[PDB]
């Protein structure tokens, strides 16, 4: 049995075309199309808040050109 | 149609117990268990080289406590 370390890196910006009525999951689903990360392994953040899958972008005042942050969440 | 930005972040270290005979894919499969990233969306790097899925850790002189780097690769 061999022990190694893996340092994970991601530091990129992606643009999404979405609707205010979209849930955080529908956003997580668009993200999954780009980066392949399962939505249940994405933690989305905006303006100091962690975003909840069942709630909509409109519920967080996410608007045109808002910057969301995506943290990869291990399993 | 609304436009937003998603900034992706990952900056963590993971430990893997592997075998020198393991392919980069078998490593990518252990990684996928932890972080959920599909292996075909992982770019593994070691010591300035990009690692090839069909080749083994032994082929790159990956040994005990080697530090591999994982770059998330979009789709």
């Amino acid at each position: 049995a061999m022990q190694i370390f893996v340092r994970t890196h991601a530091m990129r910006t992606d643009v999404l075309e979405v609707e205010p009525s979209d849930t955080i999951e529908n956003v997580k689903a668009k993200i999954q199309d780009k980066e392949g990360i399962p939505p249940d392994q994405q933690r989305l953040i905006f303006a100091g808040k962690q975003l909840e899958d069942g709630r909509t972008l409109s519920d967080y005042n996410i608007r045109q050109e808002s910057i969301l942050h995506l943290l990869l969440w291990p399993r | 149609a609304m436009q937003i930005f998603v900034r992706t972040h990952a900056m963590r270290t993971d430990v893997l117990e592997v075998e020198p005979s393991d392919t980069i894919e078998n490593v990518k499969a252990k990684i996928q268990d932890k972080e959920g990233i599909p292996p075909d969306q992982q770019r593994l790097i070691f010591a300035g080289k990009q690692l090839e899925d069909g080749r083994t850790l032994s082929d790159y002189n990956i040994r005990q406590e080697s530090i591999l780097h994982l770059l998330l690769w979009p789709r």
Binding site: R43, I45, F46, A47, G48, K49, Q50, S66, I67, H69, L71, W73, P74 | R7, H9, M11, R12, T13
Partner: peptide, 19 residues
């Protein structure tokens, strides 16, 4: 885990001014 919580804290911090 400790790493994930520290990263979460870092990114929440960052989002306070990068939104």
């Amino acid at each position: 885990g400790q790493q994930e919580e520290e990263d979460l804290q870092r990114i929440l911090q960052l989002s306070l001014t990068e939104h």
